[PDB]
Amino acid sequence: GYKVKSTTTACCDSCVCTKSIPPQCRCNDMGETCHSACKQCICALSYPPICRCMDNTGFCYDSCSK
């Protein structure tokens, strides 16, 4: 037997993916930080700070808001 499950709580509300095999996806969410799976979080040092994750993934994280 086996299970397939997420071991992350990272989430993305606006995930955009190329329509390709395989897909190239990114999370376009902006906030005061990035989600807990983000390797490359870029933040403008404004007040409030504005951060977005620049990682490219082959899938989308679950929605934060649904």
Interacting residues with a copy of itself (CB under 8 A): 1-10, 22, 24, 33-45, 51, 53-59, 61-62
Which residues, 6 or more positions from 39, have their beta carbon under 8 angstroms from its beta carbon? 55
21 CB neighbour count, 10 Å cutoff: 5
**Taking the complex as a whole, how short is the minimal distance between the CB of residue 21 and a copy of itself, in angstroms?**
11
Q: How far is the CB of 6 from a copy of itself (least distance, A)?
A: 5
Q: Residue 45 corresponds to which tokens in the numbers above?
A: 């040092």
What is the closest distance, in whole angstroms, from the C-beta atom of residue 14 to a copy of itself in the complex? 16
